[PDB]
Amino acid sequence: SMQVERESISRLMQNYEKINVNEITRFSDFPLSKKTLKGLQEAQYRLVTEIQKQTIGLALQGKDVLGAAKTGSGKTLAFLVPVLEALYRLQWTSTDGLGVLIISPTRELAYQTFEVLRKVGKNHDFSAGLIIGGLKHEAERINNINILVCTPGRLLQHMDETVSFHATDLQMLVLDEADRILDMGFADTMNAVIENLPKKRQTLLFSATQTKSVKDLARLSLKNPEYVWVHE
Ligand SMILES: Nc1ncnc2c1ncn2[C@@H]1O[C@H](COP(=O)(O)OP(=O)(O)O)[C@@H](O)[C@H]1O
Ligand SMILES: [Mg+2]
């Protein structure tokens, strides 16, 4: 297909240029698919937080973003909303393979992000899977998965020891809680993961804090990044 969805997508995209954060209080003030809006509304998410307001628009427009805001700010939806929309704009489906990698620092943090994604993205037609360790069972299922939520070590493992894993068609890389990723010692793991990905992609980096190392990474991982910070 689909001919109608192409028209709908085209209209959303014409409205990307007109995005103005001073006119945004609600998720529905951004130009978002009906499926994303339904999922947000069904999950009781209606008004945007400041970091969501200041980063979702730029991500919709295809830009690389470093978003910095303390814990509790709403960073998860700040990248998940753009993740869903990136694949929706392409009419991505389960047969299209790996479109988005979201990397979180620990198995519990990865799991928490995965749960938000499966609640808020439930009205979309993409597959989502969680890879966090704790084997071969995993590989069997994930070759077909559109959105993978991962921990850094397990992702690099899948990469190194799975012949069928490829990210040739990756659209977006997201680093969730990027300052913790780095403070755990995963800088070298991250660079190796990045060697296995296409340069052409969009990359979002979300961090709780302003650290030297995350700003350094924003140069290992990001193309002319849009820096955005929020406080108080
Ligand atoms: N737009 C919103 N409206 C109301 N609550 C929200 C919104 N976005 C996030 N939250 C809630 O605020 C809390 C923190 O969000 P979360 O993404 O985990 O923050 P962070 O990763 O920045 O620490 C969670 O309870 C989440 O459900
Ligand atoms: Mg978080």
Numbering used by the authors: 45 to 178, 181 to 278
What do the authors report?
DDX10 is probably involved in ribosome assembly. Fusion of the nucleoporin gene NUP98 with the DDX10 gene leads to the NUP98-DDX10 gene product. This fusion protein is involved in leukemogenesis. The 6th residue upstream of the conserved glutamine is an aromatic residue in most DEAD-box helicases. Its side chain stacks with the nucleotide base, stabilizing it in its position. Interestingly this residue is not conserved: While phenylalanine is most common, DDX10 has a tyrosine and DDX47 has a tryptophan in the corresponding position. In the crystal complexes with either ADP or AMP the loop closes up, resulting in a shift in Cα-atom positions by up to 3.5 Å between the ATP- and the AMP-states, or by up to 2.5 Å between the ADP- and the AMP-state. Thus the conformation of the P-loop is determined by the nucleotide phosphates, and longer phosphate tails result in a more open loop.
DExD/H-box RNA helicases, from virus and bacteria to eukaryotes, play important roles in processes including ribosome biogenesis, RNA processing and folding, ribonucleoprotein (RNP) remodeling, RNA nuclear export, the regulation of RNA translation and transcription, and nonsense-mediated RNA decay. DExD/H-box proteins often contain accessory regulatory domains and localization modules, but their cores consist of two RecA-like domains joined by a short flexible linker. The N-terminal domain is commonly referred to as conserved domain-1, or DEAD-domain, and the C-terminal domain as conserved domain-2, or helicase domain. Both domains contribute to the binding site for RNA substrates and both contribute to ATP hydrolysis. We used X-ray crystallography to determine the structures of the DEAD-domains of DDX2A, DDX2B, DDX5, DDX10, DDX18, DDX20, DDX47, DDX52, and DDX53, as well as the helicase domains of DDX25 and DDX41.
